[PDB]
Design a protein around this ligand. Sequence first.
Ligand code: CDL
Ligand code: CDL
Ligand code: PC1
Lengths: 171, 459
Amino acid sequence: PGIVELPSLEDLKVQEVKVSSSVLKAAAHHYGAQCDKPNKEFMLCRWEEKDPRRCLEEGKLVNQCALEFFRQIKRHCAEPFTEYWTCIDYSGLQLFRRCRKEQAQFDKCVLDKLGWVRPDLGELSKVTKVKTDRPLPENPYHSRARPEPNPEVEGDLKPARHGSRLFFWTM
Amino acid sequence: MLKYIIPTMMLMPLTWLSKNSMIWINTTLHSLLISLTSLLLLNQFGDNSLNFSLTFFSDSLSTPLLILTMWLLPLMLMASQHHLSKENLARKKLFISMLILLQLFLIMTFTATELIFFYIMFEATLVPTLIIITRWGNQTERLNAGLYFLFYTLAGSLPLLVALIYIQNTMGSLNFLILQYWVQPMPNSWSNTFMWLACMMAFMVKMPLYGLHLWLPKAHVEAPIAGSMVLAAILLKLGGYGMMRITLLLNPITDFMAYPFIMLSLWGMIMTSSICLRQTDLKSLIAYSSVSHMALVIVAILIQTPWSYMGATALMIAHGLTSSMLFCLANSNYERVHSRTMILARGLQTLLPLMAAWWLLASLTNLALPPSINLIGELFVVMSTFSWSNITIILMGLNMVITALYSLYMLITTQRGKHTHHINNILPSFTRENALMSLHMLPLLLLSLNPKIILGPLY
Ligand SMILES: CCCCCCCCCCCCCCCCCC(=O)OC[C@H](COP(=O)([O-])OC[C@H](O)COP(=O)([O-])OC[C@H](COC(=O)CCCCCCCCCCCCCCCCC)OC(=O)CCCCCCCCCCCCCCCCC)OC(=O)CCCCCCCCCCCCCCCCC
Ligand SMILES: CCCCCCCCCCCCCCCCCC(=O)OC[C@H](COP(=O)([O-])OC[C@H](O)COP(=O)([O-])OC[C@H](COC(=O)CCCCCCCCCCCCCCCCC)OC(=O)CCCCCCCCCCCCCCCCC)OC(=O)CCCCCCCCCCCCCCCCC
Ligand SMILES: CCCCCCCCCCCCCCCCCC(=O)OC[C@H](COP(=O)([O-])OCC[N+](C)(C)C)OC(=O)CCCCCCCCCCCCCCCCC
């Protein structure tokens, strides 16, 4: 069949978010609050195109928005954030319930200096709506032409011509 | 043909509601009325057959076999009531019911328009015949004879089922009236050869053919008298009827497939007649005589000329009456001496003169004495086989010599000579027995007067 069409290595180069999973988990709720729109454009493009090769520009916008998010954290509230993700990072399961005072420090400094509000319980799990400008994929499964079905039955059901026609049975 | 099927079935409440002393009188009376009504099948035409319905029809071939079949039932009832006098009443009614049921199967076997219904009725006629032989037969060998009679016929006829259903798939119909007009010529191949064998060997067994006839001097002997009468008179003629229906479909392959069976039957009519010259059992002598006579019907069907079919159907009707009467005469001795040995009772013309006159008439009609329809059938088959090949007159004339020899040897041994001294229970002839002999012989002698009603579809 056809040759698979991959993007080049220069199409995949982007400045990475080189932070740990506890760093990402510490500012996860503010990341969901502040980086909503390009992330949801990307995940809508990802569930509609069903192809990661059709989602590279949206992923690059995701990475750019995440980098601007952590640069906006680092300029204003770097030390309460470091105090908070170190305490998140200590735990094996990385509990949020173990670190509520460092969370209160980080959320206080973030609300005072950056105006960000941490979302309530239930908000990040909402199904939102996304205003895209790309067209809707007309055939994302690349489904070919379907086979035409067998013809249905029609007409009034007349009696059997001369019965069963079973050798001599006249009915 | 429903006007004969319905009274034949109404014989069953007529025989299961009669009084304990009335079950022979009423069944004889109403089966004689059905036999009187059986003459209405003589509305035949020289171009078209008497076509009743989609299921039943009757040409000029089936009609004499129908009158013979509807006539043979009262004669079986008269013949078979003396040896069932000591019988239980319910088993007596069961015997009469098997006879009535066999008549019912035969009269819609001959009139069957479509060939698979012919096959269903033709193999339906086994089971009452089997029950009559194996239940009311007299001696030990009735069970083995029932096995031979069943498993020769089924072994011949289950290939016939496959052949007929193949004709149903190829032609589209097994209606005989349709197959008169859609019959395709059957060329030479191996597939058409085994087609011909599957169509013919069932009726070769039922005629019987020489070599396939081993069921017959056991089934016709170990049966009771009504079973031997119906086997000699109708059930050997189902084979000739089925051959005359089925050999329409088997042309022109018959014109070279017929030769081994023609050799078998032309030699077996000599061999079985020579066997009759050395029989000690009288009922077996009449059985091998039946094979000897039906060999000519096999040859007459396979040479398939008009004279041969006319002689074959006249020989079928005439041999039916004659051989049925010969079995009844053998029963008339067996009900007095209680042995079928022919050399036991002798000199019976000194003791039973009218019975000896019936023996004389039956032995004359057995040896084809003119102007009987026995000789009409015999002579027409001889004419047509001389047209077939001129050398066959040697076999036909030598068969006629040996047939006269065994018929008069039977007559001289049973009726002539000095009477056996130590047999003192030779009663006079009953009115029942003399009436049985006369109701066989008098229609046979009346058919010499107007013989055109027993000469097939092509008179
Ligand atoms: C306004 C409202 C009122 C209107 C009133 C109108 C009616 C008035 C009369 C009232 C009574 C009606 C009765 C039924 C209608 C007539 C049916 C008929 O005769 O069909 C002819 C039928 C076909 O002949 P046809 O000339 O082409 O058709 C004429 C009509 O068009 C036939 O019509 P058809 O073309 O439409 O027929 C259709 C088809 C036509 O047939 C075919 O297409 C051929 C295939 C039929 C079956 C073949 C099977 C073969 C293998 C098995 C053999 C079994 C053993 C045989 C019997 C052994 C003994 C029991 O029939 C069948 O296939 C049915 C199956 C067979 C049953 C027949 C009816 C029986 C009713 C009474 C039962 C009593 C017991 C009878 C004995 C049991 C066995 C039948 O004949 C046969 O099949 C022969 C067999 C015997 C039939 C039974 C006769 C009925 C009367 C019997 C009275 C005596 C009983 C004695 C006591 C019991 C036995 C000991
Ligand atoms: C449709 C109307 C028709 C009217 C005309 C009738 C046509 C013929 C019908 C049948 C004729 C034979 C019946 C008698 C023999 C059977 C019974 C018996 O043995 O009784 C002895 C007894 C006389 O003897 P007995 O002293 O009392 O006691 C017996 C002795 O103890 C000891 O007895 P035995 O052995 O010493 O004496 C028996 C003797 C023994 O003699 C023989 O066995 C020799 C016979 C053969 C050689 C001679 C004939 C050869 C052929 C030439 C003649 C035919 C063609 C002629 C035409 C011109 C040329 C072509 O045979 C005769 O006397 C019979 C004479 C007639 C023979 C016919 C041919 C039989 C031979 C076998 C078949 C041959 C081919 C078929 C021929 C068919 C002809 C129609 O006769 C009677 O009591 C007779 C009773 C009434 C008989 C009625 C017959 C007809 C019944 C039909 C009813 C429905 C239709 C209405 C017409 C009714 C007319 C009355
Ligand atoms: C009484 C005892 C002896 C009974 C002997 C019975 C006759 C002997 C031969 C019977 C052959 C079997 C039935 C054949 C039916 C033919 C129908 C038909 O369409 O034929 C053409 C068909 C042709 O096939 P077709 O019709 O599907 O092909 C299309 C047509 N052409 C050929 C043009 C392409 O024949 C066959 O398929 C095979 C026929 C021979 C079958 C061989 C197996 C049976 C062997 C004989 C058994 C004999 C009895 C054994 C038991 C004895 C007692 C215990």
